[PDB]
Design a protein around this ligand. Structure first.
Ligand SMILES: O=C(c1ccccc1)N(O)CC[C@@H](c1ccc(Cl)c(Cl)c1)P(=O)(O)O
Ligand SMILES: [Mn+2]
Ligand SMILES: [Mn+2]
Lengths: 379, 372
């Protein structure tokens, strides 16, 4: 009855919330593994003391002189923890490149993978899919969690459309001309040595939604031409599924990541009192409007990369990271982020091949960065 | 593959929409029987012509005399059609008291009952429930169709609340004082329309929801949603709500009731999320509209009380239409009648028990009218 949980990336926002859900629900879950990168050693050590969990890994080579009592440490040590720890669920909330090998290891163990790491699907693609059995991957992000719930409304042959909702970001309703000269600070993107500013930039870019469309295709096996994005400023409905008879099923909740986290951990069972429900005793309205795809071409560009397949989505994401970083640094204008991704992709025919190994994904990503760094440089 | 379908009340709105669904899906369904009152004989004869179905029932004896070719005629013609005809699904879209016996006949056959007759469950209560097996009654109403769909979102132990949406009728935001002056014309009256306006329809649907899904009344909520695009929602124990949405079109829940658990391709248009739209929610003004509160009271009391609730409504509704009482007196009289109905919390053993409750309720409502 009690599920054994490995929490990877335990010190970040997703990992800390998952540990609160588990602490609230010791009848349903027990923590059996923790992993974080060496920069987060002090917090990881606090978690060991608080959870009493000693099976912990420092997920990289860093803090190398302070790991004398850590059971796993070094490059790829989170993968080793996953390989060696009996569990029912691996929550992978590692950030970026770190997340890929532990995802692959988790799938090989036969455990459920509660996947928070975007890298795994966006870059890994068919590497990750070929390692998974049907139903083994359960998403942690609000939208994909919404979609997985709404897909319960019918059999696969009855699915007409998947509809992801999007806030539209801070430039919702702006013209191309309006966006020509915006600053990173106008996007709500301010410095911090984390993926925070990148994440907020991707939200302004609509690249966030592009990535979520890619993840949707891979998670649910629905063609790109049947994955739509709708703007919904309230973010109460987190996504919807439209079925062949005309019926749409939607999932709605006040924003709170503990809900989709709880569900991914307990899948298929829901977790009592994980989050607060919508209160239908106070007036509200849920608004929907089309995405302006002329102004925000990032989403259709993600579909184009996705349709090409293989390492093309790794290329899309890696080119975005470089271009977005350039925009953050004040080196390029806002429109050039997606302009650069498009340029890199146009040159990227060699990367439509499926990746044979992790190294092919890494090669595609290095190529894409180099290619994006060139585009940025002149300009 | 082909489900044989008996359509009761074939000439009404639901009936005709159902025939069109069946005609569009001959691989899925076949019409094998029709029943109507006879008021719209033109339609029935036209339906006989288009479907080829000669297996027909007519309530009116003088209207059946008009053709003299109808195998079933009289006050129980529909019931006798159900008893005789080999079917997989009986769609009962008969109106009012006409629907109860046919519902009982249908359940007795073992066929799925696609139920569009509110009276069956609301008045029939446990008598209808005792006649049914798990899953045999499949609701046609948009709200209950939505609920059944949203329940796929989890297991039964995970359900926190069922939330029915209500249009609010044309008198959203009106005071009791405002409602005093309402004419039949303003309330769109047309018994479903009046009930929509008075919120009694929602009251009835709350009772139906309890009896169909076995959720307690204190966990069946109503929210006002004027667009009627969200048709109902379920809130699960983890805080997640699952909602069903579509442009209002009965062909959707009709198709689903006939083909359950399988969906029917192209039954209805989907929401078009490429055009801007707004879905508004607001609480019901329960001071001005207590019909749902009253329905819960009747439901909790149980037995014949919901039969009393519905019959008092119909009498009071008739009085309002006749010009004998004002609009707020409809639900006012329902309350008065229910409050006098302590003796009626007894379980109905037979159809006559239900008819006795309804008689009592009609007479008590009339006495209240003769007061005002
Ligand atoms: O299920 C239905 C219905 C739905 C669509 C079309 C016709 C009837 N009804 O119960 C009719 C009354 C309900 C209703 C439902 C949908 C609409 Cl579009 C309207 Cl006007 C009224 P109510 O919320 O007022 O109680
Ligand atoms: Mn998201
Ligand atoms: Mn209804």
């Amino acid at each position: 009855g009690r599920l054994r949980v490995v929490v990877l990336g335990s010190t970040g926002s997703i990992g800390t919330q998952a540990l609160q859900v588990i602490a609230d629900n010791p009848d349903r879950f027990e923590v059996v593994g923790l992993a974080a990168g060496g920069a987060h050693l002090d917090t990881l050590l606090r978690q060991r003391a608080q959870t009493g969990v000693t099976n912990i890994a420092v997920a990289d080579e860093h803090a190398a002189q302070r790991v004398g009592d850590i059971p796993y440490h070094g490059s790829d040590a989170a993968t080793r923890l996953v390989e060696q720890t009996e569990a029912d669920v691996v929550l992978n909330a590692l950030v970026g490149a770190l997340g890929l090998r532990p995802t692959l290891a988790a799938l090989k163990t036969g455990a459920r993978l509660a996947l928070a790491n975007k890298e795994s699907l966006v870059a890994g693609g068919s590497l990750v899919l070929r390692a998974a059995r049907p139903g083994q991957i359960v998403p942690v992000d609000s939208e994909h969690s919404a979609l997985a719930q709404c897909l319960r409304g019918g059999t696969p042959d009855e699915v007409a459309k998947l509809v992801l909702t999007a806030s539209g970001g801070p430039f919702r309703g702006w013209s191309a001309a309006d966006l020509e000269h915006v600053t990173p600070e106008q996007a709500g993107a301010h410095p911090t040595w984390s993926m925070g500013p990148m994440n907020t930039l991707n939200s302004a870019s609509l690249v966030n939604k592009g990535l979520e469309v890619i993840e949707t295709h891979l998670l649910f096996g629905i063609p790109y031409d049947r994955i739509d994005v709708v703007v919904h400023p309230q973010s109460i409905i987190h996504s919807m599924v439209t079925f062949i008879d005309g019926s749409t099923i939607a999932q709605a909740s006040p924003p709170d990541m503990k809900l989709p986290i709880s569900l991914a951990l307990g899948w298929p069972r829901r977790v009592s009192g994980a989050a607060a429900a919508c209160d239908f005793h106070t007036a509200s309205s849920w608004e929907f409007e089309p995405l302006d795809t002329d102004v925000f071409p990032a989403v259709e560009l993600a579909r184009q990369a996705g349709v090409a397949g293989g390492c093309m989505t790794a290329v899309y994401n890696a080119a975005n990271e470089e271009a977005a970083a350039a925009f953050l640094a004040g080196r390029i204008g806002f429109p050039a982020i997606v302009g650069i991704i498009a340029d890199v992709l146009h040159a990227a025919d060699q990367w439509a091949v499926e990746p044979a190994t992790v190294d092919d994904v890494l090669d595609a990503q290095r190529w894409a960065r180099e290619r994006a760094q060139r585009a940025v440089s002149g300009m």
